[PDB]
Amino acid sequence: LDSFKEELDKYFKNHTSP
Amino acid sequence: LDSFKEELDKYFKNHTSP
């Protein structure tokens, strides 16, 4: 669960660029 | 978990429209 949450946060931080 | 990640990716791709 923590690994999936971290991956989710990384995907959000990546999608904050456009 | 794979289906959840696939749905997350689909929602991320859909979020690019607005």
Give CA–CA dist B8/A11, Å, rounded: 10
Angle at B4 between CA A11 and CA B13, to 5 degrees: 50
Give CA–CA dist A16/A7, Å, rounded: 14
Measured between CA atoms, the residue of chain A closest to residue B13 is: A15
**Residue A18 near residue B17 (C-beta atoms within 8 A):** no
**A11, B12: Cβ pair inside 8 Å?**
yes
Which B residues, 1 through 18, put their C-beta within 8 Å of a C-beta on chain A?
Answer: 1, 4-5, 8, 12, 15-16
Facing B1 at nearest CB: one of A4, A15, A18: A4
Cβ contacts of residue A4 below 8 Å, gap of 6+? B1, B4, B5
Resolution (angstroms) stands at 2.8
Give CA–CA dist B8/B13, Å, rounded: 9
Cβ contacts of residue B8 below 8 Å, gap of 6+? A8, A11
Give CA–CA dist B18/B5, Å, rounded: 21
Give CA–CA dist B17/B14, Å, rounded: 6
